């Protein structure tokens, strides 16, 4: 088997800046047809992998000219000359030279961007939810940057731990921001014992940590 290696696995890049991905094979991808057999794929959040470059240096149909492949034998490189917001996702090199066909571990391109403060929303559980014996209170942090955020729950001014879970979205194809959803799960009884439900966010976007609460037992 031929081992494929990519470097680095994580690549943060400023929009408009150049970017390079390295791909090395343990054996050479001999141009015996007259072509070196290496492909490059992009997997974008929500979608299947898509061919960018084939035969080590050939762009596929509709692939923008900012992408270019180069290298020979065991040493290859994907270059993006001026990085764009839509270029975010995971990049893979794949040799199609001799089976098993092998993929590199993948490279996550991260768009770098200026700080943006999250819009903060809160949603109490529905009557429907409660009627079934569970309570999920959702706090929504929308369109922010960087990823790092601290979401705290306070119930009648008491700090909670171990009873909430966060879920972050992938970087935006256009504004290069993410959104976070921290849902706090209580029993039906547990939600009726208290009436104040607040989520405190501590982003770099906001100076003073923002709190948004609702009063209902």
């Amino acid at each position: 088997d031929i081992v494929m290696t990519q470097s680095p696995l994580s690549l943060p890049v400023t929009p408009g800046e150049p970017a390079s991905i390295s791909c090395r094979s343990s054996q050479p991808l001999l141009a015996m047809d007259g072509h070196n057999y290496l492909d490059w794929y992009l997997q974008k959040p929500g979608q299947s992998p898509q061919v960018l470059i084939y035969q080590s240096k050939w762009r596929a149909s509709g692939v923008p000219d900012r992408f270019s492949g180069s290298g020979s034998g065991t040493d290859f490189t994907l270059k993006i000359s001026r990085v764009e917001a839509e270029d975010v996702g995971v990049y893979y090199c794949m040799q199609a030279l001799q089976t098993p066909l092998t993929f590199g571990g993948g490279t996550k391109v991260e768009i770098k961007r200026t700080v943006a403060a999250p819009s903060v929303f809160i949603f109490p559980p529905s009557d429907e939810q409660l009627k079934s014996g569970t309570a999920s209170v959702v706090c929504l942090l929308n369109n922010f940057y960087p990823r790092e955020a601290k979401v705290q729950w306070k119930v009648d001014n008491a700090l909670q731990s171990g009873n909430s879970q966060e879920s972050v979205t992938e970087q935006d194809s256009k504004d290069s921001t993410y959104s976070l959803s921290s849902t706090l799960t209580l029993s039906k009884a547990d939600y009726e014992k208290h009436k104040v439900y607040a989520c405190e966010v501590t982003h770099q976007g906001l100076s003073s940590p923002v709190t948004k609460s609702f009063n209902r037992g």
């Binding site: 088997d1 993929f103 949603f123 429907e128 959702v138 979205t169 959803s181």
Partner: protein
């Protein structure tokens, strides 16, 4: 135009079997080589195997982790590609996609030798079908409204709770609404079940309706829930 559609994914018990189907359209199926690739949750793509065109023998190649247990076959008359999976293991859990390969055309030059020449490649993909290899049973999700609370723009949504296995799909207003929509990756609960949320930002409340369309194929559950404040 050119597309591949795979189906057959679902929950299967370890040691069980499952057959995946991949239907092609928009191109001469019989002329191309094809692959099966898979991607485990939060991991890299892994090649499963290839099948040559009838003209090149129609023979197969398999990754060492599946050879002997997985069988690839094609039916050119149905433009269908198959993946017969036997002796399934929990580690076989992944999203499986079919892709195209080295495409080949037969042309006769004015002389005689009708060349069979080749082109590249691994061009057409997905969207993939999910295969879950686990003991535990199926469970549809409970859908709850995340109503547009007053506490410029407003946010509303749907909480898709306690389902198994992955995945679930969420659209808004039968796909007419995509702007300001954010469906989050599912979180795995202490209960062993998944949960996710889908939320939309809007100006206008009361003038229009907002319905989330939730689909959990594994349990054949479909839910349309209007979100009112």
């Amino acid at each position: 135009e050119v597309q591949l559609v795979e189906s057959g994914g679902g929950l299967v018990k370890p040691g069980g079997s499952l057959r995946l189907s991949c239907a092609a359209s928009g191109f001469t199926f019989s002329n191309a080589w094809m692959n099966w690739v898979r991607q485990a949750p939060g991991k890299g793509l892994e090649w499963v195997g290839r099948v040559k065109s009838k003209t090149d023998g129609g023979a197969a190649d398999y990754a060492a982790p599946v050879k002997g247990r997985f069988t690839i076959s094609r039916d050119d008359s149905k433009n269908t590609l198959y993946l017969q999976m036997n002796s399934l293991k929990t580690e076989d859990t992944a999203v499986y996609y079919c892709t195209t390969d080295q495409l080949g055309y037969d042309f006769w030059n004015g002389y005689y030798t009708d060349t069979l020449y080749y082109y590249f490649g691994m061009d057409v993909w997905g969207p993939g079908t999910t295969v879950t290899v686990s003991s535990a049973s199926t469970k549809g999700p409970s859908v709850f409204p995340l109503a547009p609370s007053s506490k410029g723009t407003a946010a509303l949504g749907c909480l898709v709770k306690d389902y198994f296995p992955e995945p679930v799909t969420v659209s808004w207003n039968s796909g007419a609404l995509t702007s300001g929509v954010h469906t989050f990756p599912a979180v795995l609960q202490s209960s062993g079940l998944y949960s996710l949320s889908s939320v939309v930002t809007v100006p206008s409340l009361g003038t229009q309706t907002y319905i989330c369309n939730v689909n959990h194929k594994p349990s054949n559950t479909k839910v349309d829930k209007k979100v009112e404040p």
